[PDB]
Amino acid sequence: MDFLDRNAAPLNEGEWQRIDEAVVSTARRTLVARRIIDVLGPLGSGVYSIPYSVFSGKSPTGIDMVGENEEFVVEASRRATINLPILYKDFKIMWRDVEADRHLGLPIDVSTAAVAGNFVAVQEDHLIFNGNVELGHDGLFTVKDRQTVAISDWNETGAALADVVKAVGALSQAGHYGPYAMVVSPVLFGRMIRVFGWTGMLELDQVKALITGGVHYSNVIGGSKAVVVATGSQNLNLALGQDMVTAYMGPTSMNHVFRVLETAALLVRRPDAICTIE
Amino acid sequence: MDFLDRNAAPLNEGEWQRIDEAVVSTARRTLVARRIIDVLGPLGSGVYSIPYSVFSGKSPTGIDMVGENEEFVVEASRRATINLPILYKDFKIMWRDVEADRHLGLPIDVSTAAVAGNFVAVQEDHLIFNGNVELGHDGLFTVKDRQTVAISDWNETGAALADVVKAVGALSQAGHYGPYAMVVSPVLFGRMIRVFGWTGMLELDQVKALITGGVHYSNVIGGSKAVVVATGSQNLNLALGQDMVTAYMGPTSMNHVFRVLETAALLVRRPDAICTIE
Amino acid sequence: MDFLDRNAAPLNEGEWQRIDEAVVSTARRTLVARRIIDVLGPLGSGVYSIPYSVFSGKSPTGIDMVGENEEFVVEASRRATINLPILYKDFKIMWRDVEADRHLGLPIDVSTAAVAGNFVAVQEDHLIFNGNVELGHDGLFTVKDRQTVAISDWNETGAALADVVKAVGALSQAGHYGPYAMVVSPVLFGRMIRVFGWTGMLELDQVKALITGGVHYSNVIGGSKAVVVATGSQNLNLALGQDMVTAYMGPTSMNHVFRVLETAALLVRRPDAICTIE
Amino acid sequence: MDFLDRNAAPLNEGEWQRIDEAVVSTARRTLVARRIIDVLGPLGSGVYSIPYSVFSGKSPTGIDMVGENEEFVVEASRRATINLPILYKDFKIMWRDVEADRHLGLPIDVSTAAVAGNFVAVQEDHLIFNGNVELGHDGLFTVKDRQTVAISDWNETGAALADVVKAVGALSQAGHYGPYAMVVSPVLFGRMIRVFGWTGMLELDQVKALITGGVHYSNVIGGSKAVVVATGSQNLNLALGQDMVTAYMGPTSMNHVFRVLETAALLVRRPDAICTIE
């Protein structure tokens, strides 16, 4: 790739490999979304926007000895599009540190790069779960055609699992069978662990019996909310564009400035595959 | 390396390999810190002190189609430094034992080396958790810019998990999302297991649902205290200098004296990433 | 010459050859002045200021059979020097459009460069017609020695021909025979498109037959004004230091910023050779 | 360009040549916009959407003695992107004729292919001039920042010339100098044919002397309206994806169905470069 300046920067490849590995490992620790949602692509830098089909419709399946009928085509209810924003954050490596590593072997303070990776990963999760207003990206909690279950007072024992039962009910009614996965705001997650009092196991361990794709939490989700997702590329994807990468911006003052950038966007291919308990 | 005398000593390489392996294995059993905290380096003998950035600040992330703004740099709130102390302990191998192994094949009493390794590992943990006054090293329980949650009377059921909820609350408020890890003084650790009475599982197993980086104890932590840590090189490191190594000091009397030495120091890169429940 | 980084920008020379063309083809469209006033030079970037003569006065010519008196020398009513400012505007080719060229084949949106070239040309005209106060330049509507004609209500037929005849009167009486050229604010130029009497051609065709250097227009001139010039390097010239060129500025953010710049100024060698109709 | 099965139809390449000429010779005789507005590209097949920059509004140009201020940057009023629709219609060559009139010695009846090319070029015009509601395309008559001139009663002599003058006023005031072009509904164009004054030549030819980029009509423009366009790729482009071509669609019964299509959209890069007389 051309845009990614990696030759006017002073740093060796033995520095770049450390920095990129520190970014990748910090992302893979930090992220929730790439657990519940699959990566699509990555596609490279150059894709500004992606055309994507919306199915959002329930229709039968063919069952015959020779299958004459052609009623049974999957229909794109609308073939919409979305634009891929850049998420980025910037960090400085001091010229002193570079010259130190280039003579004394004292290793770069790549904790800067790790902190940038963490912050962009947090912004990726915030984009995906919460959406964004100014970009016009609907997120999992915002897309209008999602299922909705009026959340009960999860201070009462089993009400949380009863609401999960409702939500997987609603998903099954729309013909989204499992495997389901769920993500919970930690305010509710504590209530699934404890706030009911005690039970012979956590109500979390009860939910794990039904929601076999996993239960997760993220402080990114404000309020008392949970999203249940019929997982896999059939229903959702994260389309990367350019996967989280570290770019030289050039210097400011003598100090080198580097950028972490990523272009991921949420392809809500099947809004009927989402239920929010809220 | 030069300083490490390994040629004026009488012992063969077939002894050295046993002795070093007994040290390494005793460290890897003994240590807690290298679980919660990553190794940085090792850097060699010669680094007396390390420059390290302190971030300790909350700032937004860039989100735009082209990302014009440069407000979003990570700022080093102060670029402080720390000096790497030596931790050491010394042990004797008797000349009789050497000459025995050198004729009769009776193996060296390397349990001495193991005991030295254990004692230096205990001192490493004591430095990291408790800090030290005379060196001026602040530790996890001492650094002033840590979060603090007033500990409840964990004799009451669930109060321990309620305090964990508080602590991960406080960490989330400072924008440190997980994975969290915790270390508990065994006086409290018994209270998380038992002293509340009984529950359908241990309150430890309840905490393990939230603190997914693990729960640990160490008798090194005096009193009724717990530390919660937002793990990884983004937030903390252990910088080794010279990794735990066995050095010949020369003889005293006829007896050979050996030293175990290590130079590890605690880089509290993000005090906002620490909460102490105390 | 090295002050323009023709090799430091990422753009291949085919793209340079499209960007310069996308500047020049909007300079030629936009500029009026170079149609009225001859260019002097261009002189290169170094020529920071130019001295010029101002023959504002009139003084007698000798007539003698002997040819002896030496009083009859032409003065220069003043001698002066004027400094060439830089005219410039910045256009900002955003980085992912380069990758969209690299892989998606869709060529770069040089229309940014065209708009910058237009803004530069409009500033060149604005400077030449109305000298900048801060620089203390003078332009064709601010020169204090110039002829003036009281404009009539050009909503009446033939009134524009009458006022042009007045202006050619005053210029002739100043000693300046043609070919005259004129520039008209477009609110008047619209009023010049009328049939005139029964003469079988437009009023504009009368004016273009009398003002044989042609009638031009520009919104740069304030509404209800026009200026008439006895053309030729004898009376007016436009100095060019560096003729309009595109210069890089390195990356600012990830994006690539370029500067279109030109150095030019008006030297009013004969302030009596100009009339403004106002 | 591979998705068109020139080899799957029964027609030999001479019979393809016949029908492609039958399309092109009907397209050329009806396309207006390709004569008013510059063709972008064509980009090739399926280049689904194009990003483009809208430069409404203005900001100051830099004039200063040395280049020190960076405020003077070109920025779009918005980054924008537009979806290229498909224009198509189908025609059905009867299978019998393909060897019946072959032995009549008739070349294949191409008449329906001419009719298809006609209806294509009509939908092309209808899209470009009048926009589309469903796709949300703005057309020249619909884009909201355009200039507007209140039309006079063109039943008078010279009133149409006066309105053209008003339009060139409103365009030149915005800094868009010629060459303009105009397209007029034929209900008005039929009244622009008048002998003007005593000039002995047509008002339409006075306009063509002013509107040097040409005057045209198409029936797509409803009622008494016209539009004046500052021509050139700096102001407007016709985006072409797939340029107009014929595509096979396989048998149906045994009759052969063919598709003619083109993919095109209107890039209003500068709304202020357009004025509608209405």
PDB file of N, CA and C in Angstrom, chain A residues 26 29 48 83-90 92 97 106-107 109 111-112 114-115 118-119 122-123 132 135 189 193-194 198-202 204-205 217 219-220 249 259, chain B residues 43 47 53 55 59-70 72-74 79 158 161-162 172 177 180 198-201 205-206 209-210 212 231 233-234 269-270:
ATOM      1  N   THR A  26      -3.397  -5.608  21.551  1.00  0.00           N
ATOM      2  CA  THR A  26      -4.284  -4.770  22.353  1.00  0.00           C
ATOM      3  C   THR A  26      -5.705  -4.770  21.808  1.00  0.00           C
ATOM      4  N   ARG A  29      -7.289  -8.195  22.730  1.00  0.00           N
ATOM      5  CA  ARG A  29      -7.769  -8.163  24.107  1.00  0.00           C
ATOM      6  C   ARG A  29      -9.032  -7.320  24.223  1.00  0.00           C
ATOM      7  N   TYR A  48     -14.339   3.177  -0.187  1.00  0.00           N
ATOM      8  CA  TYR A  48     -15.003   4.220   0.585  1.00  0.00           C
ATOM      9  C   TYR A  48     -16.376   3.791   1.088  1.00  0.00           C
ATOM     10  N   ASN A  83     -21.355   3.965   3.936  1.00  0.00           N
ATOM     11  CA  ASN A  83     -20.027   4.549   3.805  1.00  0.00           C
ATOM     12  C   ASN A  83     -19.165   4.189   5.010  1.00  0.00           C
ATOM     13  N   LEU A  84     -17.909   3.823   4.746  1.00  0.00           N
ATOM     14  CA  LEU A  84     -16.965   3.391   5.773  1.00  0.00           C
ATOM     15  C   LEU A  84     -16.202   4.559   6.394  1.00  0.00           C
ATOM     16  N   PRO A  85     -16.533   4.968   7.617  1.00  0.00           N
ATOM     17  CA  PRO A  85     -15.756   6.019   8.281  1.00  0.00           C
ATOM     18  C   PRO A  85     -14.363   5.530   8.640  1.00  0.00           C
ATOM     19  N   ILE A  86     -13.442   6.479   8.793  1.00  0.00           N
ATOM     20  CA  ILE A  86     -12.178   6.223   9.476  1.00  0.00           C
ATOM     21  C   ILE A  86     -12.337   6.481  10.968  1.00  0.00           C
ATOM     22  N   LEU A  87     -11.944   5.500  11.776  1.00  0.00           N
ATOM     23  CA  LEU A  87     -11.596   5.700  13.177  1.00  0.00           C
ATOM     24  C   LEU A  87     -10.085   5.823  13.312  1.00  0.00           C
ATOM     25  N   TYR A  88      -9.629   6.810  14.077  1.00  0.00           N
ATOM     26  CA  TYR A  88      -8.197   7.012  14.233  1.00  0.00           C
ATOM     27  C   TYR A  88      -7.898   7.605  15.604  1.00  0.00           C
ATOM     28  N   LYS A  89      -6.653   7.417  16.042  1.00  0.00           N
ATOM     29  CA  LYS A  89      -6.069   8.224  17.103  1.00  0.00           C
ATOM     30  C   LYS A  89      -4.561   8.289  16.905  1.00  0.00           C
ATOM     31  N   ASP A  90      -3.955   9.364  17.407  1.00  0.00           N
ATOM     32  CA  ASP A  90      -2.576   9.709  17.097  1.00  0.00           C
ATOM     33  C   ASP A  90      -1.718   9.743  18.356  1.00  0.00           C
ATOM     34  N   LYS A  92       2.698  10.145  19.803  1.00  0.00           N
ATOM     35  CA  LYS A  92       4.045  10.625  19.527  1.00  0.00           C
ATOM     36  C   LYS A  92       5.091   9.666  20.080  1.00  0.00           C
ATOM     37  N   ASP A  97      13.839   8.978  22.267  1.00  0.00           N
ATOM     38  CA  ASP A  97      13.614   7.546  22.415  1.00  0.00           C
ATOM     39  C   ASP A  97      14.131   6.799  21.194  1.00  0.00           C
ATOM     40  N   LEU A 106      17.783   0.634  24.228  1.00  0.00           N
ATOM     41  CA  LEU A 106      16.609   0.807  25.072  1.00  0.00           C
ATOM     42  C   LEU A 106      15.345   0.811  24.216  1.00  0.00           C
ATOM     43  N   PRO A 107      14.425  -0.132  24.419  1.00  0.00           N
ATOM     44  CA  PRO A 107      13.315  -0.310  23.477  1.00  0.00           C
ATOM     45  C   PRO A 107      12.296   0.819  23.525  1.00  0.00           C
ATOM     46  N   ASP A 109       9.043   3.038  23.723  1.00  0.00           N
ATOM     47  CA  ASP A 109       7.884   3.052  24.617  1.00  0.00           C
ATOM     48  C   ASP A 109       6.574   2.783  23.866  1.00  0.00           C
ATOM     49  N   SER A 111       4.071   1.316  24.541  1.00  0.00           N
ATOM     50  CA  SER A 111       2.846   1.537  25.305  1.00  0.00           C
ATOM     51  C   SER A 111       1.993   2.673  24.751  1.00  0.00           C
ATOM     52  N   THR A 112       2.610   3.669  24.116  1.00  0.00           N
ATOM     53  CA  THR A 112       1.845   4.669  23.373  1.00  0.00           C
ATOM     54  C   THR A 112       0.986   4.027  22.289  1.00  0.00           C
ATOM     55  N   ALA A 114       0.094   0.900  22.064  1.00  0.00           N
ATOM     56  CA  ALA A 114      -0.947   0.110  22.721  1.00  0.00           C
ATOM     57  C   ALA A 114      -2.118   0.965  23.196  1.00  0.00           C
ATOM     58  N   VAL A 115      -1.844   2.134  23.776  1.00  0.00           N
ATOM     59  CA  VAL A 115      -2.920   3.008  24.243  1.00  0.00           C
ATOM     60  C   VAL A 115      -3.765   3.513  23.077  1.00  0.00           C
ATOM     61  N   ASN A 118      -5.955   0.606  21.951  1.00  0.00           N
ATOM     62  CA  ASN A 118      -7.088   0.471  22.861  1.00  0.00           C
ATOM     63  C   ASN A 118      -8.151   1.528  22.605  1.00  0.00           C
ATOM     64  N   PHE A 119      -7.742   2.782  22.411  1.00  0.00           N
ATOM     65  CA  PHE A 119      -8.724   3.846  22.213  1.00  0.00           C
ATOM     66  C   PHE A 119      -9.493   3.697  20.902  1.00  0.00           C
ATOM     67  N   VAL A 122     -11.968   0.838  21.440  1.00  0.00           N
ATOM     68  CA  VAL A 122     -13.121   1.360  22.169  1.00  0.00           C
ATOM     69  C   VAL A 122     -14.041   2.151  21.251  1.00  0.00           C
ATOM     70  N   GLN A 123     -13.473   2.935  20.335  1.00  0.00           N
ATOM     71  CA  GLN A 123     -14.330   3.700  19.434  1.00  0.00           C
ATOM     72  C   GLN A 123     -15.029   2.801  18.423  1.00  0.00           C
ATOM     73  N   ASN A 132     -23.808   6.010  15.405  1.00  0.00           N
ATOM     74  CA  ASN A 132     -23.406   7.406  15.476  1.00  0.00           C
ATOM     75  C   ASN A 132     -24.451   8.268  14.785  1.00  0.00           C
ATOM     76  N   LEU A 135     -22.509  10.586  11.400  1.00  0.00           N
ATOM     77  CA  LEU A 135     -22.310   9.711  10.251  1.00  0.00           C
ATOM     78  C   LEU A 135     -23.620   9.146   9.723  1.00  0.00           C
ATOM     79  N   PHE A 189     -25.329  -6.660  34.121  1.00  0.00           N
ATOM     80  CA  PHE A 189     -24.522  -7.863  34.289  1.00  0.00           C
ATOM     81  C   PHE A 189     -24.306  -8.179  35.762  1.00  0.00           C
ATOM     82  N   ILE A 193     -25.473 -11.494  38.029  1.00  0.00           N
ATOM     83  CA  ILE A 193     -24.582 -12.237  38.912  1.00  0.00           C
ATOM     84  C   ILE A 193     -25.155 -12.323  40.321  1.00  0.00           C
ATOM     85  N   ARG A 194     -25.648 -11.208  40.865  1.00  0.00           N
ATOM     86  CA  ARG A 194     -25.681 -11.056  42.316  1.00  0.00           C
ATOM     87  C   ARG A 194     -26.995 -10.476  42.822  1.00  0.00           C
ATOM     88  N   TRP A 198     -29.053 -14.837  45.913  1.00  0.00           N
ATOM     89  CA  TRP A 198     -28.286 -16.040  45.637  1.00  0.00           C
ATOM     90  C   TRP A 198     -29.181 -17.064  44.951  1.00  0.00           C
ATOM     91  N   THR A 199     -28.551 -17.950  44.177  1.00  0.00           N
ATOM     92  CA  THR A 199     -29.175 -19.136  43.594  1.00  0.00           C
ATOM     93  C   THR A 199     -28.106 -20.209  43.441  1.00  0.00           C
ATOM     94  N   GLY A 200     -28.555 -21.462  43.311  1.00  0.00           N
ATOM     95  CA  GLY A 200     -27.625 -22.580  43.238  1.00  0.00           C
ATOM     96  C   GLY A 200     -26.598 -22.487  42.127  1.00  0.00           C
ATOM     97  N   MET A 201     -26.851 -21.679  41.101  1.00  0.00           N
ATOM     98  CA  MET A 201     -25.773 -21.063  40.343  1.00  0.00           C
ATOM     99  C   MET A 201     -26.198 -19.672  39.913  1.00  0.00           C
ATOM    100  N   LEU A 202     -25.223 -18.914  39.418  1.00  0.00           N
ATOM    101  CA  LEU A 202     -25.496 -17.594  38.875  1.00  0.00           C
ATOM    102  C   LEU A 202     -26.578 -17.686  37.807  1.00  0.00           C
ATOM    103  N   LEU A 204     -26.406 -15.931  35.329  1.00  0.00           N
ATOM    104  CA  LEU A 204     -25.529 -16.011  34.167  1.00  0.00           C
ATOM    105  C   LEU A 204     -25.319 -17.451  33.716  1.00  0.00           C
ATOM    106  N   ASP A 205     -25.018 -18.356  34.650  1.00  0.00           N
ATOM    107  CA  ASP A 205     -24.812 -19.745  34.252  1.00  0.00           C
ATOM    108  C   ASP A 205     -26.096 -20.395  33.751  1.00  0.00           C
ATOM    109  N   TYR A 217     -20.319  -8.727  28.425  1.00  0.00           N
ATOM    110  CA  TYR A 217     -20.654  -7.374  28.839  1.00  0.00           C
ATOM    111  C   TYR A 217     -19.690  -6.377  28.212  1.00  0.00           C
ATOM    112  N   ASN A 219     -18.954  -2.018  29.037  1.00  0.00           N
ATOM    113  CA  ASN A 219     -19.281  -0.699  29.572  1.00  0.00           C
ATOM    114  C   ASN A 219     -19.645   0.303  28.485  1.00  0.00           C
ATOM    115  N   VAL A 220     -19.326  -0.001  27.225  1.00  0.00           N
ATOM    116  CA  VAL A 220     -19.762   0.823  26.101  1.00  0.00           C
ATOM    117  C   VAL A 220     -21.277   0.964  26.053  1.00  0.00           C
ATOM    118  N   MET A 249       2.620   9.870  10.367  1.00  0.00           N
ATOM    119  CA  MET A 249       2.093  11.157   9.935  1.00  0.00           C
ATOM    120  C   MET A 249       3.176  12.165   9.573  1.00  0.00           C
ATOM    121  N   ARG A 259       0.015   7.569  13.518  1.00  0.00           N
ATOM    122  CA  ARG A 259      -1.428   7.375  13.552  1.00  0.00           C
ATOM    123  C   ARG A 259      -1.771   5.891  13.531  1.00  0.00           C
TER     124      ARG A 259
ATOM    125  N   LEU B  43      16.213  -6.359  29.530  1.00  0.00           N
ATOM    126  CA  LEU B  43      16.963  -5.275  28.912  1.00  0.00           C
ATOM    127  C   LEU B  43      18.469  -5.469  28.987  1.00  0.00           C
ATOM    128  N   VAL B  47      21.227  -1.415  32.119  1.00  0.00           N
ATOM    129  CA  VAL B  47      20.271  -0.322  32.278  1.00  0.00           C
ATOM    130  C   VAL B  47      20.047  -0.047  33.765  1.00  0.00           C
ATOM    131  N   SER B  53       6.873   7.161  30.141  1.00  0.00           N
ATOM    132  CA  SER B  53       5.784   8.123  30.032  1.00  0.00           C
ATOM    133  C   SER B  53       4.668   7.803  31.018  1.00  0.00           C
ATOM    134  N   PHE B  55       0.655   8.635  31.216  1.00  0.00           N
ATOM    135  CA  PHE B  55      -0.461   9.165  30.438  1.00  0.00           C
ATOM    136  C   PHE B  55      -1.507   9.821  31.334  1.00  0.00           C
ATOM    137  N   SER B  59      -9.181  11.458  27.139  1.00  0.00           N
ATOM    138  CA  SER B  59      -9.305  12.305  25.964  1.00  0.00           C
ATOM    139  C   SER B  59      -9.985  11.515  24.855  1.00  0.00           C
ATOM    140  N   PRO B  60     -10.621  12.194  23.902  1.00  0.00           N
ATOM    141  CA  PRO B  60     -11.536  11.528  22.971  1.00  0.00           C
ATOM    142  C   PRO B  60     -10.774  10.798  21.869  1.00  0.00           C
ATOM    143  N   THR B  61     -11.537  10.208  20.950  1.00  0.00           N
ATOM    144  CA  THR B  61     -10.987   9.495  19.805  1.00  0.00           C
ATOM    145  C   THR B  61     -11.585  10.065  18.526  1.00  0.00           C
ATOM    146  N   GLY B  62     -10.792  10.041  17.456  1.00  0.00           N
ATOM    147  CA  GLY B  62     -11.215  10.636  16.199  1.00  0.00           C
ATOM    148  C   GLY B  62     -12.159   9.734  15.418  1.00  0.00           C
ATOM    149  N   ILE B  63     -13.188  10.354  14.844  1.00  0.00           N
ATOM    150  CA  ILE B  63     -14.257   9.647  14.147  1.00  0.00           C
ATOM    151  C   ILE B  63     -14.771  10.520  13.006  1.00  0.00           C
ATOM    152  N   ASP B  64     -14.240  10.304  11.807  1.00  0.00           N
ATOM    153  CA  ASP B  64     -14.566  11.155  10.670  1.00  0.00           C
ATOM    154  C   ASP B  64     -14.212  10.410   9.392  1.00  0.00           C
ATOM    155  N   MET B  65     -14.801  10.862   8.282  1.00  0.00           N
ATOM    156  CA  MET B  65     -14.511  10.261   6.988  1.00  0.00           C
ATOM    157  C   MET B  65     -13.086  10.515   6.511  1.00  0.00           C
ATOM    158  N   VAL B  66     -12.422  11.563   7.000  1.00  0.00           N
ATOM    159  CA  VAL B  66     -11.059  11.857   6.568  1.00  0.00           C
ATOM    160  C   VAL B  66     -10.191  12.282   7.747  1.00  0.00           C
ATOM    161  N   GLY B  67     -10.823  12.645   8.861  1.00  0.00           N
ATOM    162  CA  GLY B  67     -10.106  12.870  10.101  1.00  0.00           C
ATOM    163  C   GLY B  67      -9.216  14.097  10.069  1.00  0.00           C
ATOM    164  N   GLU B  68      -9.802  15.251   9.751  1.00  0.00           N
ATOM    165  CA  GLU B  68      -9.036  16.494   9.686  1.00  0.00           C
ATOM    166  C   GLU B  68      -8.372  16.825  11.018  1.00  0.00           C
ATOM    167  N   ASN B  69      -9.133  16.768  12.108  1.00  0.00           N
ATOM    168  CA  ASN B  69      -8.678  17.308  13.380  1.00  0.00           C
ATOM    169  C   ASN B  69      -7.485  16.541  13.943  1.00  0.00           C
ATOM    170  N   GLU B  70      -6.632  17.272  14.666  1.00  0.00           N
ATOM    171  CA  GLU B  70      -5.484  16.711  15.372  1.00  0.00           C
ATOM    172  C   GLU B  70      -5.551  16.999  16.868  1.00  0.00           C
ATOM    173  N   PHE B  72      -6.713  14.935  18.817  1.00  0.00           N
ATOM    174  CA  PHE B  72      -6.861  13.616  19.415  1.00  0.00           C
ATOM    175  C   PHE B  72      -5.527  12.939  19.714  1.00  0.00           C
ATOM    176  N   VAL B  73      -4.449  13.705  19.891  1.00  0.00           N
ATOM    177  CA  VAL B  73      -3.182  13.102  20.281  1.00  0.00           C
ATOM    178  C   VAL B  73      -3.256  12.645  21.734  1.00  0.00           C
ATOM    179  N   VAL B  74      -2.699  11.463  22.003  1.00  0.00           N
ATOM    180  CA  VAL B  74      -2.372  11.046  23.364  1.00  0.00           C
ATOM    181  C   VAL B  74      -1.277  11.927  23.950  1.00  0.00           C
ATOM    182  N   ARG B  79       6.583  12.838  31.757  1.00  0.00           N
ATOM    183  CA  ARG B  79       7.527  11.825  31.286  1.00  0.00           C
ATOM    184  C   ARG B  79       8.555  11.567  32.386  1.00  0.00           C
ATOM    185  N   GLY B 158     -22.028 -11.271  49.822  1.00  0.00           N
ATOM    186  CA  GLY B 158     -22.134 -10.439  48.643  1.00  0.00           C
ATOM    187  C   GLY B 158     -21.481  -9.080  48.741  1.00  0.00           C
ATOM    188  N   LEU B 161     -18.468  -8.954  46.470  1.00  0.00           N
ATOM    189  CA  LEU B 161     -18.809  -8.740  45.070  1.00  0.00           C
ATOM    190  C   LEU B 161     -19.403  -7.357  44.829  1.00  0.00           C
ATOM    191  N   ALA B 162     -20.138  -6.807  45.796  1.00  0.00           N
ATOM    192  CA  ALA B 162     -20.594  -5.423  45.685  1.00  0.00           C
ATOM    193  C   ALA B 162     -19.429  -4.439  45.628  1.00  0.00           C
ATOM    194  N   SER B 172     -14.218   1.823  35.157  1.00  0.00           N
ATOM    195  CA  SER B 172     -14.946   2.163  33.939  1.00  0.00           C
ATOM    196  C   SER B 172     -15.169   3.666  33.814  1.00  0.00           C
ATOM    197  N   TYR B 177     -11.805   0.040  30.578  1.00  0.00           N
ATOM    198  CA  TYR B 177     -12.546  -1.198  30.394  1.00  0.00           C
ATOM    199  C   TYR B 177     -11.638  -2.401  30.628  1.00  0.00           C
ATOM    200  N   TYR B 180     -10.230  -6.955  33.526  1.00  0.00           N
ATOM    201  CA  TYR B 180      -9.721  -6.710  34.864  1.00  0.00           C
ATOM    202  C   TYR B 180      -9.139  -7.977  35.480  1.00  0.00           C
ATOM    203  N   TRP B 198     -22.339 -19.997  53.691  1.00  0.00           N
ATOM    204  CA  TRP B 198     -22.426 -20.815  52.492  1.00  0.00           C
ATOM    205  C   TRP B 198     -23.258 -20.087  51.444  1.00  0.00           C
ATOM    206  N   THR B 199     -22.997 -20.414  50.177  1.00  0.00           N
ATOM    207  CA  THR B 199     -23.803 -20.003  49.029  1.00  0.00           C
ATOM    208  C   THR B 199     -23.684 -21.074  47.955  1.00  0.00           C
ATOM    209  N   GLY B 200     -24.645 -21.075  47.025  1.00  0.00           N
ATOM    210  CA  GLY B 200     -24.680 -22.101  45.994  1.00  0.00           C
ATOM    211  C   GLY B 200     -23.420 -22.213  45.158  1.00  0.00           C
ATOM    212  N   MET B 201     -22.592 -21.173  45.125  1.00  0.00           N
ATOM    213  CA  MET B 201     -21.166 -21.351  44.897  1.00  0.00           C
ATOM    214  C   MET B 201     -20.399 -20.329  45.713  1.00  0.00           C
ATOM    215  N   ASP B 205     -16.251 -17.790  43.033  1.00  0.00           N
ATOM    216  CA  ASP B 205     -16.744 -18.177  41.715  1.00  0.00           C
ATOM    217  C   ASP B 205     -17.693 -17.138  41.131  1.00  0.00           C
ATOM    218  N   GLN B 206     -18.374 -16.369  41.983  1.00  0.00           N
ATOM    219  CA  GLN B 206     -19.149 -15.227  41.504  1.00  0.00           C
ATOM    220  C   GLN B 206     -18.258 -14.125  40.948  1.00  0.00           C
ATOM    221  N   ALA B 209     -16.755 -14.580  37.465  1.00  0.00           N
ATOM    222  CA  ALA B 209     -17.591 -14.264  36.314  1.00  0.00           C
ATOM    223  C   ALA B 209     -17.337 -12.854  35.794  1.00  0.00           C
ATOM    224  N   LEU B 210     -17.015 -11.916  36.682  1.00  0.00           N
ATOM    225  CA  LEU B 210     -16.804 -10.522  36.311  1.00  0.00           C
ATOM    226  C   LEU B 210     -15.334 -10.205  36.052  1.00  0.00           C
ATOM    227  N   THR B 212     -12.540 -11.404  34.705  1.00  0.00           N
ATOM    228  CA  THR B 212     -12.193 -12.481  33.788  1.00  0.00           C
ATOM    229  C   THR B 212     -10.692 -12.651  33.593  1.00  0.00           C
ATOM    230  N   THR B 231      -5.457  -4.981  33.119  1.00  0.00           N
ATOM    231  CA  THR B 231      -4.216  -5.660  32.786  1.00  0.00           C
ATOM    232  C   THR B 231      -3.623  -5.150  31.470  1.00  0.00           C
ATOM    233  N   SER B 233       0.146  -4.360  28.877  1.00  0.00           N
ATOM    234  CA  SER B 233       1.240  -3.411  28.683  1.00  0.00           C
ATOM    235  C   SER B 233       0.766  -1.983  28.445  1.00  0.00           C
ATOM    236  N   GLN B 234      -0.483  -1.797  28.017  1.00  0.00           N
ATOM    237  CA  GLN B 234      -1.075  -0.465  28.002  1.00  0.00           C
ATOM    238  C   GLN B 234      -1.010   0.223  29.360  1.00  0.00           C
ATOM    239  N   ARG B 269       2.600   2.812  34.584  1.00  0.00           N
ATOM    240  CA  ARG B 269       2.368   3.741  33.480  1.00  0.00           C
ATOM    241  C   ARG B 269       1.038   4.479  33.582  1.00  0.00           C
ATOM    242  N   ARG B 270       0.024   3.877  34.200  1.00  0.00           N
ATOM    243  CA  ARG B 270      -1.313   4.472  34.268  1.00  0.00           C
ATOM    244  C   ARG B 270      -1.913   4.277  35.651  1.00  0.00           C
TER     245      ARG B 270
END
